[PDB]
Symmetry: none
Subunit: 188 residues, 2 copies
Amino acid sequence: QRHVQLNPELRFERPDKEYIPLPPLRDMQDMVKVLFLLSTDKKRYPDGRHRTLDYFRVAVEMFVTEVRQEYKRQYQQAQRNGRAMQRFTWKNSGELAICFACCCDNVKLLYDSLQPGPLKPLWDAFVGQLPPMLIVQSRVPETMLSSQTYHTKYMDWVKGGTVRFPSVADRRVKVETYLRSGAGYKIE
Amino acid sequence: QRHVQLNPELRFERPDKEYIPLPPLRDMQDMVKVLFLLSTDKKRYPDGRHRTLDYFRVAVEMFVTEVRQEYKRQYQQAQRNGRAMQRFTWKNSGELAICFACCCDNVKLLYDSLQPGPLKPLWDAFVGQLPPMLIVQSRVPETMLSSQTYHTKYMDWVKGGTVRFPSVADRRVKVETYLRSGAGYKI
Ligand SMILES: [Cl-]
């Protein structure tokens, strides 16, 4: 469904070393939908089959939860003060940023786990599919939070790799904890 | 197995002039695996049957060995210097490049040795299978070493054969020497 099936023992049907087979790849429309299909087609790609995919799905779920909560908070704050919310404010050091970094970390791992082939999208094209998927799942209007803003935040993540922001390992524990227990923690 | 059977005497069961039969091909999914099947199915295509196929297998083995070793070295070098390795560095003049050129030389020879007919893949499709096979066998992440880089290096090889680097003949001897070497005597 929308939510990832919990996996307390972190057990997967296929080994971590195995490549994930690609969805149908014949044409350009197939190519742009690869990430969306990996993410959402639980008939072809059930929860619990591939560790890399489940981790990515969890990161997405956590991000979507946070962006929706933050959007609602900002919208209500604007309303209480008699003003129209003009744009979503994306802070670079909080829970949203952390969740987005999880998405980026795991979309990279997912990309590397996908079966190579002549029609496998290039990395830039593949990671370019991430904002549209987050937009649709979040239901946050693009007039409030644009693909261009996502691009900026992606660039920030690229730069941070090459404050007391969680490391890659910290972020993986965050994802694993959620997958095991359904438990998320935002520092307050 | 994973490794090519050593062949100190360079003896092959079939003559070099003989065409290699294609694997059974029902569909387009079969078609995109043709190179991988030729390369890895040693039940249908045992080592020591076709010189052309064995030479290609050796080229692949040498390349895969080198790319994995070079990746590991670069990854460790990055770690020691407190940085996340961002991209694989592909040197154009060393063992890696030489082995890649061997792969290209021999994938061409292999293609030309495949039994002609309507089922034989087109060249563009066939050579297109080479980078994915090298990626899968190496297990080097594509975020580090992309298909696009392979494409660029392939083009470099095409351009070089339309300096300072082993010739086609030298690269063939390289392959032959590897295939012969490690059986316990030098021949
Ligand atoms: Cl390049």
